[model samples]
Target chain A: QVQLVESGGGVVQPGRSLRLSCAASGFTFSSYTMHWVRQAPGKGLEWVTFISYDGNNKYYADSVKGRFTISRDNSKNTLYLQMNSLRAEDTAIYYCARTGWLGPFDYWGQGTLVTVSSASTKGPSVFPLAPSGTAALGCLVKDYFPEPVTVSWNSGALTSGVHTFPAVLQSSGLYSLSSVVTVPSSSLGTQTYICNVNHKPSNTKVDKKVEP
Target chain B: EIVLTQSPGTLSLSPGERATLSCRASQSVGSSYLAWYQQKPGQAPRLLIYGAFSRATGIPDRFSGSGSGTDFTLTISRLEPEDFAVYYCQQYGSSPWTFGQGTKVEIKRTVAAPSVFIFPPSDEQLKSGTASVVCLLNNFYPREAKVQWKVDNALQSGNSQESVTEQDSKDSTYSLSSTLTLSKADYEKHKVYACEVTHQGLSSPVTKSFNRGE
Candidate 1:
């Protein structure tokens, strides 16, 4: 009976801004918290942020920290999310869920897809880093590539040892990425890290190396 | 944040039977901020109880709620036909508030449609220039209906009003009465007064009209 509907444009442009809203009904609106969540195409679910009932408190995911603004209108019992300087990777299906002091995402809204599309291209800057005892030894890719890019690793054998995670976006309009590989500390000096950068347009693996 | 777990996702019962729903929190949620709601299919959820156990305005005393901290119960004594619907429990005592999944109250038999009537002031009272008129809707099962007033062939707005919708314990039927005030000039000058009732069972609106004597 208590229901929510998400509204706003479904598409946005690169380096620009967009806003989305979650309209609510069936109960007193200002009595709880509102959250925004999204899932990029073929990607895992992501938490954007949430606004408190009084519209004073907010919590954002580390990846979107400082870049995403979450707000609420108490009078209307509606929630809003706005972001700027977007990239194609920001294209996602967004959802709005409500919560209170101690609760679950029991109430949810239908998802709305927002695609950020355009053509501004750049590649990542790869840096091979030293190995650590507890963490995987890997390379860090810095800077924007218009569309999103990923890092690939080659150890000269069958490889699934590489782990990839998207980077945080900076106000400078560029993003940073990191990928790590599992290698023994003893092999740190004996082994070499071949960093392969992959972008959608060029399906080929561009390889580079970091020498110890 | 604590999780709210609602039990017995669905309840099938007959009219005049007792109905009980449960909501348990993962952690203590004290009695001060718990509430209950009833959501009839295709209709907006209505607040039945708030503050853990207090009945909301217009909600009948038969729909009672009780609980504290992590445990809560909503019991409808002698369930009415209109009370057959989904019930939800929510807690407000913590941040990132949460709700129980939901417990549905389904009925076993078909019921009758609701009825409406208009109770206008006496002729003596009408001569005083100002009066209050009541639109009463009775015995409607499923509890879904809309009632409004029309004066001189147009809808009435901006008038002082008071309304109460209640469930009858014995019959499982609903009753609602809304009172509207009419000014002496408008009442005396208006040729016709109407109470328009709209319900799911009616093919069209049912209007009770009162025409001034020539």
Candidate 2:
């Protein structure tokens, strides 16, 4: 008989903030913890944040660490999530859930949809490394928005052994990719290689050198 | 991998007193992925806390959990009569999920002894082909007791079953029942039926008997 209903979802302009609420009934609100989860269009569920029953403790996901805040009004038996600096990727259906001491999410509220009007893009941070005892140079690109980013090496002769991995989405709502280019055993410690990352949405290009 | 060990094999406290149980891990239990559970005699363990400190569904606020990494604590701010049971700590953070043996919370005072009763089959049931004789034990403390049935002073095996221990809400005393079923032919062949109970609160086994004619 436990029930939770979410409200306060709508379009918000980029750089603006939004506040969502979840009203609960059929149970004591202060006796259990509440969690906020979201799912972007065509994407899997993502954990946003949670507020404890006593209104004293709160936890946030990496993606919303600094931008999201969770609070509760015990008297009203309601929970709230206030998000700042909304972006297009933040457009998703947000749900409120209940968890008990043993850890399974038992009850959930019908989600509310919040859409951001404009897109916001961020460029990737690139790191170049020469792995120990390996005949390869590696490039790690992380924290990029809009998922699609191209990684290429400056060494045309090493193109045949290059391996570019698929982009992975992080809990922080950012994308990361790793690319490795094999170097000949003879040239392992004698050369320098360049890793170039091109992000179209961010209109940014980064170059990092891995020196043996 | 983390190995969890609970301390103080048993906790002795009275109702209204604070009960604090400890669970120590061999290594860090990442993200406070530890949980605590409560179990009563003959009942499945119930989750008391998850994610280290989050109280599970319907758990009272008086039951609070804290600690991270290697050391965790479950505190009952004021122990209730029903809270005098077993508690266990489990970690789901790493492979080979581990659990603490358990900590038993028992009353500090002298335990109570059960009052025993034996109920014989009714006249109609005596005439029926099958009938059951039931034994009831009431008001015992500590919730642990053993029951056995005897036919004509001889041990009756495999024909009797004991019920789960039930607790009295007000005084926290315990009760249980055991039933022995027999066919009319077997009942006629037996001259006496007896229910014997062995309990920690009793120095000797207590017996309640029903004669065939009585």
Please name the candidate that would achieve the greatest lDDT relative to the true structure.
Answer: 2
Residue-wise C-alpha lDDT for candidate 1, range B1-214, written one tens digit per residue: 4678888876767879999899988988754577786766544355677777877767888999888878899999998767887787876544544566788776643454655555554443455454555565555666657777888878887663433333344554555555566776667677777888888778888997676542
Give the Cα error of residue B174 in candidate 2, in Å: 1.3
DockQ score of each predicted structure, in the order shown: 0.01, 0.01
| Candidate No. with top TM-score | 2
Q: Cα lDDT for residue A193, model 1?
A: 72
* Candidate 1 chain A worst ten-residue window by lDDT: A129-138
Q: Give the per-residue lDDT digits (tens) of candidate 2, residues A97-136.
A: 7775455455778788897754347897765544332354
Error of 2 at A197 (Å): 78
For all candidates in order, the CA lDDT equals 0.66, 0.74
What does the lDDT read for residue B160 in candidate 2?
68
Off by over 4 Å in 1: A1-19, A22-54, A59-69, A73-79, A82-212, B109-214
